[PDB]
Write a protein that binds this ligand. Structure first.
Ligand SMILES: [Ca+2]
Ligand SMILES: [Ca+2]
Ligand SMILES: [Ca+2]
Ligand SMILES: [Ca+2]
Ligand SMILES: [Ca+2]
Ligand SMILES: [Ca+2]
Lengths: 160, 162, 160, 160, 160, 162
């Protein structure tokens, strides 16, 4: 069972796109979204990883109640939203709290209702509709094994 | 020189994904549904009292506010434009309003006085909020001026009185 | 498939105990709770019913997001919480939103996770612990059929 | 011990000035305040009273947690903020929840800390600073006996 | 008159149990509570202390309005909550804001109303009821001097 | 043609009566006090990073936003005016800002582009928020333009670098 720490940048329900500057650990308001949309899950990145975009690997965490920007959550992957946009790959690892028995029933991507996966997909397709040049070329959900292999690659990229 | 005004009942505060709706015989607030998309109402949303629109409900309204109100609250309002759209149940236009008698909104007199970014975000909401509801759609949506808005309010009042 | 309107008096997360005056339809603050507890679900009653206690039949509604006091929700029962306290028998019907396919997987009491049922039970067992004269003798979950039986009894008593 | 129902129009912390239209019982947004101020207590009026201004007698209720606009609270008077503004008298009866033992220590105006009375006075002196023509000619706190005599007068004005 | 800085981890009203990682200063979500309960006061720890349990000495701070996780508050002790659970002795120091004249009337444990002390006690007695393996053996309020004695012990252990 | 910008750390979100403040050696957020008046910060409030004002702290800033942020959050910002005031610890000016690089604020270039109602409410806050604190005051407060704002930012940066 793979587990890691996720730093949550943006709580579920937010239109303010907070980001962590990785050099300093400070929270910054990147922008107020130009679309009438809100993050469908708590959103952030996986500590000690490094991705295609220059940043740590993005992460989505399912929670019963959202946290605050900058909060750490020990998490375990259950799938991943593979997306290629105009800038290349920017995949989003879907996770649940690690070590919490209320989430033991969610082990892989099939265990997450289709309604919630569809709404997450909808967010990332459309949230930058009113920012020119942005679009999604592909967007598919893939399973836990895919997520884990992708995490483990991003961890090696970070180390070396 | 003497500006039109009316009362708007706000059903849904800005930032809501719960789609509340007033029942028009009883005056009770009902939860229609939780939205299926990760979207939220871009303004306070409701209807004009004592009007009747071509979907059998009172005419839809959007009110620009400095801070949202609660479901069921009345706001005296004046029209500045309208969002024309057509969904599955046909035409369903939305009158854009500001608070009446409030000098902080006097710079807004017609649809061109509303920043385009806000007009586009409102439009984006209605175009997409039912994207994940089977058999639902919204097509042909665009913005028209205070004149067209007022003339349509006028009709809906006429429908109501009948 | 039985369904009815529930008026929600108290949103999930509240320590203010709101009640609807049935003579008038106005929302009243009965009291601020004496214990550091909060309603674990949206809470209220079923319209046009009369419980064995003389008020409309109490209802709990599972929701993805809470509503406001006074709000109507079309609901369908999936179980019932049976309790005996100082004033005797008291039942609370557990419901989900009617006509919403996101809740079609919840058909009976066994479909609600145990953690959630235990938390609801724990609320009603303990929330009046610091009000003198109160107690709870027993508290048990029963299934949809027993829930539907009590809804019918309470409908028939309203008409009476 | 005098007690009455107060309809709360404006929860503590609000800059939106809600009002009840007394002919219909509907909640209306009268205005967003022009000053950077917020109601220091839950604020409303006493049901079945009638005052100098044409409206029911205004009321302030001390609470551990604010309510929602339109909510009823059974209350008992502990004092009153006598104020004369440009429109004449518009006194505000200060109250606590009736029948709640957590408020038994507050029986008259001396029992309310000076810091809270000063902040309430400050609100009503300044909240209309940025609306022309408004000002306060006098503003003093008076005791429970004064409040009660003033309530009982406003109740007779209503009845007859 | 003893005073110290308290880092608030958890605002009043929270069911999310946030903790500060003492190695790093980052805020972490330890867990969502298993009971329908919420922290009755802002909750955290005293800076540069070490409790008998190995973490900084826990602190509760009475406030007119909650703060955010990670926020420092200059505080002075007025009492202490002594508890024994499954892992043994655990003390929580009850405090008010230091240098604030609105709290000068609270000097010792007898100055905090009984309803509030009982609610705080009830939280710590019951909040872990649905976590298996937990229990509470005893829970008692002691006065300011015993609080100040434990603050000193814990300061001396930090320096050690 | 090339506009000045800087980073503002927001200590207090709009609508707050809790007066939070960042410690300038550690970067920790502290609660200074709960305000004594029934007032709340009319905008998000904070300071400009890497500056030093004439009260020994970094230069105070106000940032106009569509939605508030949390205590400690950074916002890249550009100045549009300044609120000059003098309290008990003497001069303590406040630079008025909007988000930098955001076309929704491009119509705001100088202090005259900010509606007067918002400028007056900001002023009212600072004039009165310490009315009930013994021995505190705020006098001589008024609004000046982007030029005076930028030149003062410039100084405070110069002070800082020293
Ligand atoms: Ca990314
Ligand atoms: Ca319509
Ligand atoms: Ca009942
Ligand atoms: Ca009045
Ligand atoms: Ca501890
Ligand atoms: Ca300063």
């Amino acid at each position: 069972a793979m587990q890691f720490d996720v730093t949550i940048e943006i709580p579920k329900g937010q239109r303010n796109k907070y980001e962590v500057d990785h050099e300093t650990g400070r929270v910054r308001l990147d922008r107020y979204l130009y679309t009438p949309m809100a993050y469908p899950t708590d959103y952030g990145f996986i500590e000690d990883t490094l991705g295609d975009d220059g940043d740590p690997l993005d992460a989505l965490v399912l929670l019963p109640q959202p946290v605050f920007p900058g909060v750490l959550v020990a998490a375990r992957p259950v799938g991943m939203f593979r997306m290629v946009d105009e800038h290349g790959g920017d995949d989003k690892v879907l996770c649940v709290p690690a070590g919490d028995p209320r989430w033991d029933h969610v082990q892989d991507i099939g265990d997450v209702p289709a309604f919630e996966l569809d709404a997450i997909k909808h967010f990332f397709v459309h949230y930058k509709d009113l920012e020119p040049g942005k679009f999604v070329k592909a967007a598919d959900w893939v399973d836990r094994a895919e997520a884990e292999a992708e995490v483990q690659r991003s961890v090696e990229r970070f180390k070396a």
